[PDB]
Amino acid sequence: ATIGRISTGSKSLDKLLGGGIETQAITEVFGEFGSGKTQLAHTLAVMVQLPPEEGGLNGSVIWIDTENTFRPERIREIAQNRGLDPDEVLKHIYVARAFNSNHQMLLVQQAEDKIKELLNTDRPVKLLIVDSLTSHFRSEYIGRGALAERQQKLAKHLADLHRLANLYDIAVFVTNQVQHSATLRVYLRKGKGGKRIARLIDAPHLPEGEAVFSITEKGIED
Numbered sequence: 001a002t003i004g005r006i007s008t009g010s011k012s013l014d015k016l017l018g019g020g021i022e023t024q025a026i027t028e029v030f031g032e033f034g035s036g037k038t039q040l041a042h043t044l045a046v047m048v049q050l051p052p053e054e055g056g057l058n059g060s061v062i063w064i065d066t067e068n069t070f071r072p073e074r075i076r077e078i079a080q081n082r083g084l085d086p087d088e089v090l091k092h093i094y095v096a097r098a099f100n101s102n103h104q105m106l107l108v109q110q111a112e113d114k115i116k117e118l119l120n121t122d123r124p125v126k127l128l129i130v131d132s133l134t135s136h137f138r139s140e141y142i143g144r145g146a147l148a149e150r151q152q153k154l155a156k157h158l159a160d161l162h163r164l165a166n167l168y169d170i171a172v173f174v175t176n177q178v179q180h181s182a183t184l185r186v187y188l189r190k191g192k193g194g195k196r197i198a199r200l201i202d203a204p205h206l207p208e209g210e211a212v213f214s215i216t217e218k219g220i221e222d
């Protein structure tokens, strides 16, 4: 029932987010290629495994990869530099590669089996990443009539994701690349000096400024 919050690594981003990404919610990060969507996903997959006084939820991670951008050595790096054992961190991340959008849909069903298994253990799943939420959908549904059909399949997939978030008290974190019904939309862009800037889109309950952070050996951080 009460909502959990997963620190991103960046104090600035966390404040913008109201303390971190929420369980019982789908948080969508969207932005151009190279903006940092996948790096934020990597960092979150580590942060969630921290205890709560360090901004985590003692959680396991399920990661649905659609573009083969998951890097286990990046996870090990981030974990090591934040004082976690990198091999242990990796063992609590369950990555599956989605071959196409239908298999991506099926993987969400399978995620429920893994979630149920871990639920009342000491490392329940607390984060479900889809990176990228839309890349297969953009690629497969194209041409006259595909707008309605793509949106319908995507809405179904997002409904499935929202049910897991709410039913199991999990944060869902999804990426979308920009040249549907997410709970919170975060616009990410690359700024001057290598900085990254985040802004919330249509989110009255949180701050209306922008967060600024860097991508480092610790993942993201101010």
Ligand SMILES: Nc1ncnc2c1ncn2[C@@H]1O[C@H](COP(=O)(O)OP(=O)(O)O)[C@@H](O)[C@H]1O
Residues within 6 Å of the ligand: 031, 032, 033, 034, 035, 036, 037, 038, 039, 040, 215, 216, 217
């Ligand atoms: N270890 C690192 N330290 C600093 N910047 C990094 C590191 N690793 C990757 N990056 C930067 O992250 C950016 C890519 O982020 P990425 O999450 O893949 O973008 P997206 O998923 O939004 O296309 C690149 O600019 C790259 O230089």
Ligand SMILES: [Mg+2]
Residues within 6 Å of the ligand: 037, 038, 039, 069, 131
């Ligand atoms: Mg990416």
Ligand code: NA
Residues within 6 Å of the ligand: 003, 004, 005, 006, 052, 056, 057
């Ligand atoms: Na919490």
